[PDB]
Amino acid sequence: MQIFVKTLTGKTITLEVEPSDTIENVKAKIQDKEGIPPDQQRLIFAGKQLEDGRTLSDYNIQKESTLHLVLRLRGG
Amino acid sequence: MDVFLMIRRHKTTIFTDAKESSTVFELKRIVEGILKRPPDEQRLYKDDQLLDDGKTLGECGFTSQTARPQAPATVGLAFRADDTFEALCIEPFSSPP
Amino acid sequence: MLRWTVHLEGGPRRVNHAAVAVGHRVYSFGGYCSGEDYETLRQIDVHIFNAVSLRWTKLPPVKSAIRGQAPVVPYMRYGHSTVLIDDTVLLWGGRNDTEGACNVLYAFDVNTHKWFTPRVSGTVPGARDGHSACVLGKIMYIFGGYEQQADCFSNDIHKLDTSTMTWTLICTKGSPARWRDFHSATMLGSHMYVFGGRADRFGPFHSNNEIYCNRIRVFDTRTEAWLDCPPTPVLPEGRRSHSAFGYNGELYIFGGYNARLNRHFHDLWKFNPVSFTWKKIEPKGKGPCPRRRQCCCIVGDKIVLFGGTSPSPDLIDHSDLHILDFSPSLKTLCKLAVIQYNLDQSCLPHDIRWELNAMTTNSNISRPI
Amino acid sequence: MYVKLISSDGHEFIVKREHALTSGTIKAMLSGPGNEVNFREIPSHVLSKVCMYFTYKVRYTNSSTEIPEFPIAPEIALELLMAANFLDC
């Protein structure tokens, strides 16, 4: 599965994942691609916050979906 | 609405303000309070144009947009000498090097 | 009329710091900076800008008072607040990347530069960052921010009565300002004016419905009520991480960031609480570039504005400082002209030459990256 | 109501006392022990500009409407700076 992760500003990151992969795995892959530590990442789909324990298939996230990424505002 | 002025005679310069709607005569009464000569002994000028007592400053051409506090408009002043009036004479300011 | 009269470099390179003016000296605490360490054990920082000599200095590290006992000093953090009451700075909230947010109250004596943690009672507000803080007499008012433990935006007001060091969660009347962070709150008389900030359009949780507030909200500290206020036909664009300050009875807001527009600001807006109206103001001179989460502090008729972050010509952190002078003297205007026209200064008297030097010499806290 | 400020070259500038109090130095002189002030080191082309600054400062204090700046030409900037420092305005 190919999924997309977009911050509110507009940067888009394409990730290669399986529906079995957990949200912790997705944040880890985002850290590999963008260098953002997982504890500074908040992932949202369909207006709900995605918990690290569950996987992508648990949240009905299929191929070509976009997740919304919220980041810690260290610079306000 | 307000005009900012320099009233100038010889080596005298009065800084004052007045309304566009105020009269030349009212301006002469300000001069009288400061320089102790009555309005009938004064002539006021916009450049070489002698101004009439009953005209407003606006009617004389003074406008708020061209008589700003940081760039006031000049009104020339001449006093009656004995039976006639002195020539309008304004001494220039000094010069930078 | 109002003018940007000083632009200096070489200061602390910080965004999301907090600062207060103590007389003619601005005290700046902590803040974030890219590439620098916010994980390991580090003391918070204090830099002092002297608004007369126009010089930055930095205080040395806090030492242990007694053997074994750790130095008493907040850990390095960003997103905290600082307010001044008499000789005491009260520092509260904020976070780093490791220990998260903290809710221990810290007090810093502006004359001895000693830190302490006064014993507090009452309902201590949850740890958070991006809250606002302001004071009326001996009372500090905390509003909003993002709570770390509850993991949500706040719209509570907690007051700290410093006479007894007692926290109280205020049971307010009226409709509270929407849960938000990185807003401002400013006291004009007895009323607290809350402007801007990031929020969610439906409630207190992130839900991918992020909005930027621009409807000013007013809290009366006397009745402890949120007021219903008249419409403002003109108003600034919504934004977070602007600076707000109260000057001569009116509220001013500078700069900030709107993520819906992806826009940084360097505008200046004035709110007159009596007519309850907004007006955009254009200072003379070249301002700071559009930026967010700078700090602004009032010194007399001047605003000291410094730090912040902005997009790089991908963000840069600012080490510069700007002075906005609400009432420039002729001496200030002439100094600017002498500088602008590159005139020979060597025949000026030494007192004026010292002033010209002060406004044209960078400090050495930082160097270009 | 009005005071007289005399330049080094003998020009007499008559300005409102309240406007002249923009200068700390003139304010102190008008309340000296035991009117008019004579400035032996400020020439008329400089002192006239100073008086314009007085008018401007008083008119536009606590003003938020867009207004022109106070213009300072290069040829006068050093002298005007020296006068402003001496006059504390």
Numbering used by the authors:
A (entry chain D): 1 to 76
B (entry chain B): 1 to 97
C (entry chain A): 1 to 313, 322 to 377
D (entry chain C): 17 to 50, 58 to 112
List passages from the publication reporting this PDB structure.
To understand the basis for C-degron recognition by KLHDC3, we crystallized and solved the structure of a monomeric version of KLHDC3-EloB/C bound to ubiquitin at 2.0 Å resolution. Blades 1–5 contain β-strands that are contiguous in sequence, whereas blade 6 contains three strands that progress into the BC-box, and an outer so-called “Velcro” strand from the N-terminus of the domain that fastens the β-propeller. Together, the blades adopt a funnel-like propeller shape that engages three major surfaces of ubiquitin: the C-terminal di-Gly motif occupies the bottom of the funnel; ubiquitin’s preceding C-terminal tail residues bind in the funnel stem; and ubiquitin’s globular domain engages the top. The KLHDC3 C-degron-binding site is formed by two distinct chambers, which are separated by a ridge-like feature and analogous to those in KLHDC2 termed the N- and C-chamber. Residues that precede the substrate’s di-Gly bind in KLHDC3’s N-chamber, while the degron’s C-terminal di-Gly motif is buried deep within the C-chamber. At the bottom of the C-chamber, a basic patch engages the substrate’s extreme C-terminal carboxyl group. Key contacts are made by a KLHDC3 RSR motif (Arg240, Ser241, and Arg292), all located within blade 5. The structure explains KLHDC3’s strict requirement for its substrates to terminate with a C-terminal Gly: its Cα is tightly wedged in the stem of the KLHDC3 funnel-like structure, which would exclude any side-chain larger than a hydrogen. Asn16 at the bottom of KLHDC3’s N-chamber pocket forms a hydrogen bond with the carbonyl of ubiquitin’s Arg74, and also interacts with the carbonyl of ubiquitin’s Leu73 through a water-mediated hydrogen bond.
Members of the KLHDCX family employ Kelch-type 6-bladed β-propellers to bind substrates, and a BC-box binding EloB/C that serve as bridges to a cullin (CUL2 or CUL5).
